Amino acid sequence: MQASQFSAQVLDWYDKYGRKTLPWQIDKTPYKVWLSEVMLQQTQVATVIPYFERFMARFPTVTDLANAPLDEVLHLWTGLGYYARARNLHKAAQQVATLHGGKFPETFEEVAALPGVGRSTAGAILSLSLGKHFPILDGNVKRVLARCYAVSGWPGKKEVENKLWSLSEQVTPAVGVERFNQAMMDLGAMICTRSKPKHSLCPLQNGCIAAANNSWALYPGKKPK
Numbered sequence: 721m722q723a724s725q726f727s728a729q730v731l732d733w734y735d736k737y738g739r740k741t742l743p744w745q746i747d748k749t750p751y752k753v754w755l756s757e758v759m760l761q762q763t764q765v766a767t768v769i770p771y772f773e774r775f776m777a778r779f780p781t782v783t784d785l786a787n788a789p790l791d792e793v794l795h796l797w798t799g800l801g802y803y804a805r806a807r808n809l810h811k812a813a814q815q816v817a818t819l820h821g822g823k824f825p826e827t828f829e830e831v832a833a834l835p836g837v838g839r840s841t842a843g844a845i846l847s848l849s850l851g852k853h854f855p856i857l858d859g860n861v862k863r864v865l866a867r868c869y870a871v872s873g874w875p876g877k878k879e880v881e882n883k884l885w886s887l888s889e890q891v892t893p894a895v896g897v898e899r900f901n902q903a904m905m906d907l908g909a910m911i912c913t914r915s916k917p918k919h920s921l922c923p924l925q926n927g928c929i930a931a932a933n934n935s936w937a938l939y940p941g942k943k944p945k
């Protein structure tokens with residue numbers, strides 16, 4: 721379907737059915753969004769909430785996190801798994817304190833330079849917390865776009881990844897970008913799921929190719945072997 725229709729239908733859906741009450745969505749700041757994104761990378765929302773609250777209480781600012789001993793950070797992380805995320809989290813806090821005066825950077829290049837932060841995550845931090853014009857491409861987004869536009873091939877290959885980044889940019893609006901990006905993650909997480917996606921609850925059901933062809937299993941493509 722047309723790019724302008726994609727954006728409008730997703731935004732209208734978010735307004736009435738989207739999640740807007742999570743802790744990291746109230747009184748948003750780059751620090752809070754960054755922290756939530758790292759915790760959410762490999763952990764479900766229900767498990768993350770208590771940890772997010774404990775971290776914000778112990779570390780009100782990024783400088784407080786930077787000055788704390790690494791052992792205390794790892795102790796508070798216990799139970800979230802994938803500790804490389806925590807080690808990079810502490811190094812990034814120290815980089816913000818050292819190079820940016822304790823104020824989380826608000827430009828793409830500076831954010832993407834932080835340990836543990838990639839292209840998609842940097843775009844998420846800045847679009848969600850400040851409304852800057854950047855698209856995202858996590859597992860959730862790849863699933864929705866690949867199915868709606870029938871993008872076959874394994875995203876692990878450069879040519880396929882490039883096509884998906886181009887599509888995301890095409891459908892991502894400037895006006896309301898913070899609402900649109902959160903909505904796309906919401907959809908891929910609860911509606912357009914890995915298995916048995918719930919088409920009847922999706923705002924893209926009237927134009928999605930996978931839904932029309934009953935071929936959601938083909939997108940995104942899997943690693944060939």
Ligand code: SF4
Nearest residue numbers: 912919922925928931
């Ligand atoms: S209609 Fe079905 S496959 Fe298509 S984006 Fe929505 S949930 Fe995914």
